[PDB]
């Protein structure tokens, strides 16, 4: 249960764009600042910038 401090605009299929307050299911956050998150709204995978999300 993470919260995207802001809306992240992805630029490739290896990442998903989120909005501010959007909840994302973090997956792997030990690889790089870009953790893999999965949206539960539609069900799609997409890395995410950690500087744009925070642990509630």
């Amino acid at each position: 249960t993470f919260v995207a401090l802001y809306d992240y605009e992805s630029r490739t299929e290896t990442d998903l764009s989120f909005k501010k307050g959007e909840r994302l299911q973090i997956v792997n956050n030990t690889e790089g600042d870009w953790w893999l998150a999965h949206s539960l709204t539609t069900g799609q995978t997409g890395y995410i910038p950690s500087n744009y999300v925070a642990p509630s």
Partner: peptide, 12 residues
């Protein structure tokens, strides 16, 4: 374990 290493974007 490869697309997680990227240059974080500019925060708002």
């Amino acid at each position: 374990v490869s697309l997680a290493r990227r240059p974080l974007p500019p925060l708002p």
